[PDB]
Amino acid sequence: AGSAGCGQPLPPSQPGGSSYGVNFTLSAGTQRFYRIHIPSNYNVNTPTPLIFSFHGRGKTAESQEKLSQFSNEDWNPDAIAVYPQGLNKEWQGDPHSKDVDDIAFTMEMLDYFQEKFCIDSTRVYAAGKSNGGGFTNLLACDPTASTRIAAFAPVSGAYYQDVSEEACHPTTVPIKCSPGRPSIPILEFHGTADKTIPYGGGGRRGECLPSIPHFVREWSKRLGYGLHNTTKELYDGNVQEYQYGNGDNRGIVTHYRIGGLGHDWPSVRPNSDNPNGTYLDATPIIVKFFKQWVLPGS
Numbered sequence: 001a002g003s004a005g006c007g008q009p010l011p012p013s014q015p016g017g018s019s020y021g022v023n024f025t026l027s028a029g030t031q032r033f034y035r036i037h038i039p040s041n042y043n044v045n046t047p048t049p050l051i052f053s054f055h056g057r058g059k060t061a062e063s064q065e066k067l068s069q070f071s072n073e074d075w076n077p078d079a080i081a082v083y084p085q086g087l088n089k090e091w092q093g094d095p096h097s098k099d100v101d102d103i104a105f106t107m108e109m110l111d112y113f114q115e116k117f118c119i120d121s122t123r124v125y126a127a128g129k130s131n132g133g134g135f136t137n138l139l140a141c142d143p144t145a146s147t148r149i150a151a152f153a154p155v156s157g158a159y160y161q162d163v164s165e166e167a168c169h170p171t172t173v174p175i176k177c178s179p180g181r182p183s184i185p186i187l188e189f190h191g192t193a194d195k196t197i198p199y200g201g202g203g204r205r206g207e208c209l210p211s212i213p214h215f216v217r218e219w220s221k222r223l224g225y226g227l228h229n230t231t232k233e234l235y236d237g238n239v240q241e242y243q244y245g246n247g248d249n250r251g252i253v254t255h256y257r258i259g260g261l262g263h264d265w266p267s268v269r270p271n272s273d274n275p276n277g278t279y280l281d282a283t284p285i286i287v288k289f290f291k292q293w294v295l296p297g298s
């Protein structure tokens with residue numbers, strides 16, 4: 001479904017250029033910032049997909065664009081890419097983020113993009129690294145945002161639960177989540193050697209992180225009746241791909257476990273996270289995943 005902005009010309013200092021930085025003031029008055037990349041094939045009459053990519057704690061929109069490579073037209077030819085900036089270089093959900101409504105920021109950003117661009121409102125996506133992956137999950141866990149965003153790709157996400165380290169049991173801790181629709185697509189990447197946001201979860205900064213299998217299981221549990229899974233060994237079995245599904249919706253929840261990888265956006269080439277490279281590039285996999293899943297009618 002093409003948005004109201006269809007037919008409108010691009011903002012006049014923006015068509016396939018370097019990303020552009022924009023100040024944007026929310027209804028209630030906080031001035032926020034994002035960088036936006038317009039695909040070189042953008043047409044003002046063609047409903048266009050949109051990807052939000054949320055940076056890690058202490059990082060920036062600009063650094064996240066370099067890391068996540070969603071402005072790379074070889075990997076993402078079709079979608080607008082938006083890199084929002086977190087206040088204090090962090091996002092809602094972090095133990096340090098207080099009374100910052102980043103969900104409202106995201107929702108008002110989306111409303112803006114629908115107004116000014118030809119957005120396909122059935123193909124709006126969210127991805128993020130770490131704090132930004134946690135925030136991606138919060139979007140999926142929000143009754144409203146989960147009905148407006150088609151699919152979600154947290155990378156090494158930090159799914160902080162408000163439970164003390166002493167009481168933290170990472171394989172069973174409740175994960176606070178209220179999706180507004182069934183069949184939410186989730187793609188999660190995580191390194192087994194992550195020391196920052198551990199694969200096995202546990203106490204962190206006064207709060208509690210779930211184990212990543214626990215996270216994955218809790219999402220898949222929602223697919224409910226007909227639930228099945230497969231495992232595949234990839235890259236000579238250094239990577240495991242787990243897919244959950246039901247009545248022929250195979251992989252609606254997918255997890256890549258990357259053996260030996262740290263707290264890193266997966267890339268074959270060096271990136272700002274990881275100087276060595278790993279077995280695979282997450283971003284093409286994420287783009288393909290987004291393409292698999294649209295927001296269903298109603």
Ligand SMILES: *[C@@H]1O[C@H](CO)[C@@H](O)[C@H](O)[C@H]1NC(C)=O
Binds near residue numbers: 021022023031
């Ligand atoms: C955004 O706002 C700040 C002041 O709040 C200003 O310093 C900055 O240059 C502005 N940037 C753009 C792209 O408008």
Ligand SMILES: *[C@@H]1O[C@H](CO)[C@@H](O)[C@H](O)[C@H]1NC(C)=O
Binds near residue numbers: 273275276
């Ligand atoms: C990169 O490779 C070196 C060995 O050359 C290793 O010591 C280091 O832990 C690696 N770093 C990461 C982030 O994987």
